[PDB]
Design a protein around this ligand. Structure first.
Ligand SMILES: Nc1nc2c(ncn2[C@@H]2O[C@H](COP(=O)(O)OP(=O)(O)CP(=O)(O)O)[C@@H](O)[C@H]2O)c(=O)[nH]1
Ligand SMILES: [Mn+2]
Length: 307
């Protein structure tokens, strides 16, 4: 029997903010690593494993928007990064693009993870338009470098946060909504790995859907009542925060979890929703889990690739 090790690695300020908020919210069986040039921020990290990179280059400060310094910092700490990753079967690298440490170091961290044998997923933000064109261009180069280094990449443009707030929503509450993309994806995969299903999916199926694929979508939806399966499936695939929507997906892993009432008909309905929304002939990997503790709730987990 296989026991997959999942790790989440925050790189730079926004990545380490996401790690801190995920640890606060509560996650289990997931190991966290914080990587930064900024020593003061690392002192505030809740991560069990902390790597300060680039101290000779930055004297414990951030990289000051210089991605070449963030890249050199990570490269010069390769052995320390390898040691922290060793043993991971899957690594999620999260970082905010546009600055120096995230833009420059995150693609190096991802390359090291993949070289170490981990299935490597990047979840990164693009800067708000109000941060200006140069930051957006620098972030775009980081995204391209990430894409070349990971198995799959999920990009969250921060401008989409402006579509989900009202005029008073606290900035921190908006940031938590972006964190949910990563957190719910990690949780969904962790649950798929650990919980035996009646139509069982495991980590090998995650590897098949994700390995060397490029852009990806990861989503969870939960609903109850009439039309629950369709409603949960639509929620799983319809996040307003994503650069890569479901449209165009050629491969999908879909798991449905429900109670003993889970019907064959509604499983087909959920699968058809995903395929219809992809508007492609999708190569599906389908799973089902019966959790009797659940009563009327249904949970649909989707990972889509092949764009
Ligand atoms: N959604 C979200 N975006 C963030 C968050 N923190 C920063 N950002 C965004 O990430 C981008 C990079 O910020 P940051 O992670 O602090 O960069 P850095 O590379 O570590 C800083 P330096 O350039 O000094 O090394 C910012 O321009 C902003 O768009 C966060 O917590 N949540
Ligand atoms: Mn800085």
């Amino acid at each position: 029997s296989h026991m997959a090790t999942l790790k989440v690695i925050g790189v730079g300020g926004g990545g380490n903010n996401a790690v801190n908020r995920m640890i606060d919210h509560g996650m289990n069986n997931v190991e966290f690593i914080a990587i930064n040039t900024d020593g003061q921020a690392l002192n505030l990290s809740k991560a069990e494993s902390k790597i300060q990179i680039g101290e000779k280059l930055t004297r414990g400060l951030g990289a000051g928007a210089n991605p070449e310094i963030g890249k050199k910092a990570a490269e010069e700490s390769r052995e320390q990064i390898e040691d922290a990753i060793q043993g991971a079967d899957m690594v999620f690298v999260t970082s905010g693009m546009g600055g120096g440490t995230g833009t420059g170091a995150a693609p190096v961290v991802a390359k090291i993870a993949k070289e170490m044998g981990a299935l490597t997923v990047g979840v990164v933000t693009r800067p708000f338009s109000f941060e200006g064109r140069k930051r957006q261009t620098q972030a775009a180069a980081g995204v391209e470098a990430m894409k070349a280094a990971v198995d799959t990449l999920i990009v969250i443009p921060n401008d989409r946060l402006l579509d989900i707030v009202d005029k008073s929503t606290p900035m921190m509450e908006a940031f938590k909504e972006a964190d949910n993309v990563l957190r719910q994806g990690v949780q969904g995969i962790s649950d798929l790995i650990a919980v035996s299903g009646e139509v069982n999916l495991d980590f090998a199926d995650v590897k098949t859907i994700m390995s060397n694929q490029g852009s990806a979508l990861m989503g969870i939806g939960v609903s109850s009542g009439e039309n629950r399966a369709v409603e949960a499936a639509k929620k799983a695939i319809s996040s307003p925060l994503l650069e890569t929507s479901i449209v165009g997906a050629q491969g999908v892993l879909m798991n449905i979890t429900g109670g003993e009432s889970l019907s064959l008909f509604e499983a087909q309905e959920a699968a058809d929703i995903v395929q219809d929304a992809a508007d492609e002939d999708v190569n599906m990997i389908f799973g089902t889990v019966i959790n009797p503790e659940l009563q009327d709730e249904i949970v649909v987990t989707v990972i889509a690739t092949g764009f």
